[PDB]
Subunit: 1011 residues, 2 copies
């Protein structure tokens, strides 16, 4: 038989699914959730051997350990140990599409383990082995005898081993196949790995056992009363003496208990379930669960003799909460949710797809620290510990079946096929059976990108029938089909329709009110955070808030899926698609995270944090209105710091305690601020600070901020009468200006400032020139490649229009000596193949103070694709340590992504002014800057800038950040105008019209002087 | 592997299901339904061997014919050749309830066949083998090599044999298992058999082939326009020159045709199906399909080339009809259906479960001849030919999946189990794929008696998704669960509620108007026709006609499941559960048919015919109001015969053509009749006769009848005053009377008329005594057995009250001589253990004309269960050939089943007064009789009677009809009153209160004389 090429065989001899078991024999240990002696971990060192095919595996390996084998850590992905290559592919299958067949060359991982079993385990009861995650299919032998087979890489596989194990030493033999018919339903946008990547354990259960238990909570109208209903099921001999006691604990206080014998109510004409019981406990004024306040109870389930012999005890954390969709709104405990979510893949730069507690906690700390309240299990059931953590810290979970068939043509070819229903159902049913008790899980998902098939309908109904407590969602086949309770599009824009045939992505605002439509809209995927992205993010959150039935979304995605590789010197670097010899690959498309692989934040993460704020603010005179977006909690760990500053210089500050009811408001009256004499703009800045530590944040954490412009005094005082008059020297090649120790040189052949002198030292390595192009972002490139050009993408439009190779023809270059200054006037035309793209007219005015006033006026042709930027650049000879500016900061910001930025006097070391995006591009811009200080230099005006050791050319010519070499000096980019970054998706033009440079005629002015 | 003990494996290497194929290579042959050279029948003589288990099957059988094996006919059940015993069990499984395991002793049927192929089939193409029916699971080998495995006894299993076939002799090897995990989903109340019981054939398709097609017909508001929609799917190498033409034919006239290349519309973000095409044909004024008028079109699907080379063609019959539920009603072509239905099992007394064309035709003819318009496929998909015949003759079909888990505890144990969804799905999905193109199939059914589980809901949805054309129904778990579009209870009563816990069977009238309920009600099973049954059938049909949303039901059931056995003499006799040594067995519960196994009518059939009439009548003066219950057809093959009779003697008659439109009315004026001068009751009997022969009926067929009482002239003249005078002889022991040669003897100890003489010849072999009991009907017994008494059952109630062994204590016996007569007055008390149950007070009067007038007045105790009858009985010495009577007839009729009966003079041979029920009981009664003639005797009055060679005693002491012997002379049972027979079900008291003998005091009078 070839079971790994048969969608009719998804397992052999596998035990039934169920919620997390520990088989406690003491009820207090169950209650306290302390470790169980009946649940052993088999994690540790195993013997591993790699083979090109299952046929290649030597018959002796079943009976005896192989000498060639190596000792490896388990859990692990065998790609991470370097046995074969991890493959990154986006849509296209890593194998030839020929269901259900896989290549005869199938990388086979032979794991083994010699382990010990106590006599006591074999003298009584049942001894089983649980494999939490095996990718993608595996056969299991024990002591040489075959046990079974199993598929689905993301759910536990369990087998009874009692009749196989002997006292003391035993040996496992797990032959794991990389490819199987299972792989056809596992086509997620991620690294294609394999092996025993989750926990392995041994569970001893009594013969007469708890085989399943469902916990439910239902509520009276105002949620002041609840009935906890627990349905318990058993295996073994049914006897009159059997009972179940379900007790409910709140810390140490037992709030409810119920005891009944077995034998459920009459179900049908043949009776009821004699092997079942339902316990109903009344709970007065229950503490409710939410991501805001994750109140938990502990439910202990005791199977026992009536006379008081505990046979075994299972347990779980209970969260009293209700999820329902009413009148088109998704409600948690009667209140409409606002999903501040992110899509999270299980990824580690070093370990691949093996999850650990430390990492999982770090993710949840960071998510909650950045105002996320939800997470999508994209696109599979997660590690069991994740759901427990979300229960405890507080995050709404979308639990998603392991069904992705994205590379099928058409996408629903398998999911419409009734012969593929058995395999699909197990990915849905065994998910529900495992996780249905977790309070954190609020929504079920039928998978991702598998079109819409009749199998989606059958399964949707199955979950509705089995579990009435949670809405079922699914995006495939149009995101509003009969398979989903929530409209859940991916990358639907706020206002713009993308009306594809059959599966249009309507404006989310437009979608809600289509003829006959009523359901809530929460995007399963939005704001593609690929490279320099997240532009246009605020547009989403303005809409989410304005529209009741727009209840948020899940950002794509959490972490960059980059992997650590090592160079000739042994130095680590972040690698992506293709870097492991893997081909075909979708290159850097695996990196779309708000955080890097090592969990270092991208600059976009702060933009998400600002938008997902839980407190809204308005200003009216001296009164600040604070509005709470919390649904259940009071502002009981919050105060408001406020700061008024004249262009960076602190004027007045104070603290006011935040006392806002959920959905409520607080009017905070500011003290009469004494206005200053000196000119400038007053800036109010408020920050919500948490004075006290929490489970998720430290004392002094900042949860929210906002800024306003207050009064402005425009400067009417002019500089003093100049102490000298600058001299001009004329040559055929050059205009040269001299004043004190300052010197300027304008080349008359080129028409640019080609050198500058402070004292006697050079100041330039490259002349000051106009620049209308940028090192293309990931959103600029889209899907375009050298082999396969996408002409619609921005980068190709600029290339084809000739923007990158257009050369400056000089039209005018003159010098005039004024009464107190010298005036250099120039004009340039940028041309490509007989087409004028840009004209740049400048005046440079240099007076007796030592200041150079540059005035730029640029014309852009209407029929040329809008330029990336409209500015200047040069390579300064200086290399300073610090960058000091008055403008938006501290972090990187761009026109369509600058709401999180605040205007203040910022001071950073040079290296921070560069964002190390793994795929190098235009980066580190700071907008709305009025003054920039770098070493001896000061620039003043109203500009946008970046400043680093790397040129735009080097940036656009390098594919990985580690290959970047610091150039001589410092590359300075000062733009009057910069195009938006986009990011609604990363495969088609996504920069909004209002952030495109399309005015035709642009003006900006800079003053360059020594500070 | 043990593949027959694993629900996860239901097939191995099996091909996809699909509508009926023939791989026609000529388009005209396809249009005309003529045979295809590409479809060979492998029916005929096979080689067969039997084994106790699969382990017992010798390994040589795979490549070599076993010498011990026999030559048998296939299709066949191996129980029918006597290899082992067929088992009849109703609910309790024929195997130990141990899912998924079956017995180690598992009877194995080894089938083999040596065959040859055409040369060209070896050259090229796809040669598959089709197994239409294998019970219950099998492995297939070809030329020694293993091909595949299959399950589900009631749907075809297909396997490709292309790579297995060779030149010359080829050999198949089929190992058939009686028990399998599939047995758990196949617990229908029926004989449990096994083997290859449906057709075996070979189909040679091209490699580029039509692999699937679906035909849909949708309409405008008035059905004057239709769009026929044909989606066609292909397999093989796609080519640009490939086309599909779907042509529509009305006889030899092409009405619509459509041609297209491959490649359907865009479905999702990955495109459309390149291997598919949908053809849309406009059809003006389509001839519509119904049971009344089965208008059929022919659609031909041609896979051809653009230049005009046919590759292959498929085809089906098309019936333009629309099924929808609107406003609570089931509509067919916009008109509310009235389902005159029956359940039909696939049964034959000799061939077991093998179906033949002749039998299937014989059933449909009889069904249609008895006013049925609908059939339920209880409880499995049928032999392919049943659907074709139903299309062509016109019968509404409920197609039912092969899923019955009746003996589970509780009934839904498997069906609520997600681990049984895979195996369940295939039984539903492969059914729809096979039968969806049939116009006869109006309703899909999810199975029968399997409780209600999540799987039902999931599978319900799957069909609603895949085929919106047809409603989905299912009865399990309370007949109104979320898994049914129709309220479809089994054995719910008209007015009486049976408020069972969890699964009540409400009054069908009450059920409709339950709070919130809107759906239509059609009983999937009603009126249990077990033995002498169908009492209270008219109550259903009155309710069906009055209540729009009561739309009928399916009678249980069509045919007795009795098998032919043979005695040592060689005589055939009808056998039931237990008669093959089968134990546990459910005895006679397999026979619940309106006909015997050989399709001979039970009396109950004529009652079903009468109540399911399509013409309703009312009388007003001399005017008959005839109303058509037809929805679509005009009365175009009908004329009315009206007959007027004075107590049997014809008075006036005539003919009137019926010109009634559907739902229309007609008035027929009767010519003023001769007013009879002589006394008596006038009767009117109208008949609807079909002058012309049809496809389903002979010329002169009677389809409807009705009777009325017209004017009555009561008799006022007294009988001729006689000359002679009866002479009394008194004795201690006897009272005797003489008149002429006629003589009467009254025993003064017993109090009964013990003998009668005419000349020397004596008239009685047993005294004339009171009878209060009957030989218990199947509806009297129910489930009650000797080993397990059901005290609630009617028979047991009588038994316990001592009705059967009560003795006649004589209270009074006096003789008086009158002026012209002798008067014998008696009084008897019936007592069991000191309790007087009955008292009988009689007066016998013998006058000078030799006429004996009996007056009977009975008292029944109120605390005793109501008596089965109140009458007299005796054994006459006479054996005459004829029975001539004036009353209801000619067929057997009972108080709650006498509507089909008609009042007239009836004359039948004696054996016709007996009804040969396989399980004998009270039978052959006729009610409302005013005169009875037998030999020299005549009885007059108003009585109910049966007359046979079998005593009530023998009938109740004899368990099989073939064991009955004719007793000396003739037994006569004249009842003044007879209890209803019942039959709403056959496991609890079902006789309606108005047909129970509960008046406490009863009167009746008979006149006995000798003409
Ligand atoms: Mg498989
Ligand atoms: Mg306790
Ligand atoms: Mg590639
Ligand atoms: Mg603002
Ligand atoms: Mg099986
Ligand atoms: Mg009548
Ligand atoms: Na909202
Ligand atoms: Na991606
Ligand atoms: Na680059
Ligand atoms: Na009706
Ligand atoms: Na039956
Ligand atoms: Na009997």
């Amino acid at each position: 038989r070839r079971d790994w090429e048969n969608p009719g065989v998804t397992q052999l001899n596998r035990l039934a699914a169920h919620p997390p078991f520990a088989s406690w024999r003491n009820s207090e240990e169950a209650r306290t959730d302390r470790p169980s002696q009946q649940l052993r971990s088999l994690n540790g060192e195993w013997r591993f051997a790699w083979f090109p095919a299952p046929e290649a595996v030597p018959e002796s390996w079943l009976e005896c350990d192989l000498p060639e084998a190596d000792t490896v850590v388990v859990p692990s992905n065998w790609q991470m140990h370097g046995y074969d290559a991890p493959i990154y592919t986006n849509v296209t299958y890593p194998i030839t599409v020929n269901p259900p067949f896989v290549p005869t060359e199938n990388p086979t991982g032979c794991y083994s383990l010699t382990f010990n079993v106590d006599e006591s385990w074999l003298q009584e009861g049942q001894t089983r082995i649980i494999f939490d995650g095996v990718n993608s299919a595996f056969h299991l032998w024990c002591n040489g005898r075959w046990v079974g087979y199993g598929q689905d890489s993301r759910l536990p596989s369990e087998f009874d081993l009692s009749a196989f194990l002997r006292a003391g030493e035993n040996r496992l033999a797990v032959m794991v196949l990389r490819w199987s018919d299972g792989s056809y339903l596992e086509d997620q946008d991620m690294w294609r790995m394999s092996g025993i990547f989750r926990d392995v354990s041994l569970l001893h259960k009594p013969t007469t056992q708890i085989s399943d238990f469902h916990v439910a909570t239902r509520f009276n109208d105002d949620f002041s009363r609840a009935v906890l209903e627990a349905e318990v099921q058993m295996c073994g001999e049914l006897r009159d003496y059997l009972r179940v006691t379900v007790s409910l604990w709140q810390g140490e206080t037992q709030v409810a208990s119920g005891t009944a014998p077995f034998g459920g109510e009459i179900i049908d004409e043949r009776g009821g379930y004699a092997d079942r019981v339902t316990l109903r406990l009344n709970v007065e004024n229950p503490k409710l669960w939410s991501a805001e306040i994750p109140n938990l109870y502990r439910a202990v389930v005791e199977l026992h003799t009536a006379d008081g012999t505990l046979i075994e005890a299972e347990a779980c954390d209970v969260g009293f909460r209700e999820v329902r969709i009413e009148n088109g709104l998704l409600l948690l405990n009667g209140k409409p949710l606002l999903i501040r979510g992110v899509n999270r893949h299980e990824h580690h730069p070093l370990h691949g797809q093996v999850m650990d507690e430390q990492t999982m906690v770090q993710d949840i700390l960071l998510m909650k620290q950045n105002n996320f309240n939800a997470v999508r299990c994209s696109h599979y059931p997660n590690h069991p510990l994740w759901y427990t953590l979300c229960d405890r810290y507080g995050l709404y979970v979308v639990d998603e079946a392991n069904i992705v068939t994205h590379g099928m043509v058409p996408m629903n070819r398998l999911t419409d096929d009734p012969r593929w229903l058995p395999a699909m159902s197990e990915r849905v049913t065994r998910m529900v059976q495992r996780d249905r008790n977790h309070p954190s899980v609020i929504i079920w998902s039928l998978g991702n990108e598998s079109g819409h098939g009749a199998n989606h309908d059958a399964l949707y109904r199955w979950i509705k029938s089995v579990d009435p407590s949670r809405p079922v969602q699914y995006e495939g086949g149009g995101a509003d089909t009969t398979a989903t309770d929530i409209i859940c599009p991916m990358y639907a824009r706020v206002d713009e329709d993308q009306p594809f045939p059959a599966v249009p992505k309507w404006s989310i605002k437009k979608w809600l009110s289509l003829p006959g439509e009523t359901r809530p809209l929460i995007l399963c995927e939005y704001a593609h955070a690929m490279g320099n992205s997240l532009g246009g993010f605020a547009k989403y959150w303005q809409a989410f808030r304005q529209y009741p039935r727009l209840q948020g979304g899940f950002v794509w995605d959490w972490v960059d899926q980059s992997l650590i590789k090592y160079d000739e010197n042994g130095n680590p670097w972040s690698a992506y698609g293709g870097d492991f010899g893997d081909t075909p690959n979708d290159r850097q498309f695996c990196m779309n995270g708000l955080v890097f692989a090592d969990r270092t934040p991208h600059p976009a993460l702060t933009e998400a944090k600002h938008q997902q704020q839980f407190f809204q603010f308005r200003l009216s005179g001296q009164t600040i209105e604070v509005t709470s977006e919390y649904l259940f909690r009071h502002s009981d760990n919050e105060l408001l710091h406020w700061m008024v500053a004249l262009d960076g210089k602190p004027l007045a500050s104070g603290e006011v305690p935040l006392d806002v009811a959920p959905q409520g408001k607080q009017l905070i009256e500011l003290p009469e601020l004494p206005q200053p004499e000196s000119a400038g703009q007053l800036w109010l800045t408020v920050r919500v600070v948490q004075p006290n530590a929490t489970a998720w944040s430290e004392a002094g954490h900042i949860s929210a901020w906002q800024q306003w412009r207050l009064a402005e005094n425009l400067s009417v005082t002019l500089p003093a009468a100049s102490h000298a008059i600058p001299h001009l020297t004329t040559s055929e090649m050059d205009f040269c200006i001299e004043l004190g120790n300052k010197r300027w040189q304008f080349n008359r052949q080129s028409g640019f400032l080609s050198q500058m002198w402070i004292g006697d030292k050079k100041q330039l390595l490259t002349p000051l020139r106009d620049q209308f192009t940028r090192a293309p972002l990931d959103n600029d490139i889209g899907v375009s490649e050298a082999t396969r050009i996408d002409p619609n993408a921005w980068v190709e439009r600029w290339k084809a229009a000739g923007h990158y190779q257009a050369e400056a023809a000089l039209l005018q270059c003159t010098a005039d000596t004024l009464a107190d200054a010298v005036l250099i006037t120039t004009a340039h035309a940028w041309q490509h193949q007989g087409k004028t793209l840009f004209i740049s007219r400048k005046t440079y005015r240099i007076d007796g103070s030592g200041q150079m006033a540059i005035t730029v006026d640029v014309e852009v042709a209407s029929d040329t694709p809008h330029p990336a930027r409209i500015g200047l650049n040069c390579q300064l000879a200086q290399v300073a340590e610090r960058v000091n500016w008055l403008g938006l900061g501290p972090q990187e910001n761009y026109p369509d992504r600058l709401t999180a930025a605040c205007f203040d006097r910022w001071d950073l070391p040079l290296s921070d002014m560069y964002t190390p995006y793994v795929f190098p591009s235009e980066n580190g811009l700071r907008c709305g800057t009025r003054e920039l200080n770098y070493g001896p230099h000061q620039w003043r005006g109203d500009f946008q800038f970046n400043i680093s050791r790397y040129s735009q050319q080097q940036l656009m010519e390098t594919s990985h950040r580690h290959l970047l070499h610091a150039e001589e000096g410092t590359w300075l980019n000062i733009d009057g105008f910069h195009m938006g970054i986009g990011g609604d998706d990363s495969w088609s033009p996504s920069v909004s019209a209002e952030f495109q440079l399309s005015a035709g005629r642009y003006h900006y002015q800079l003053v360059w002087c020594q500070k």
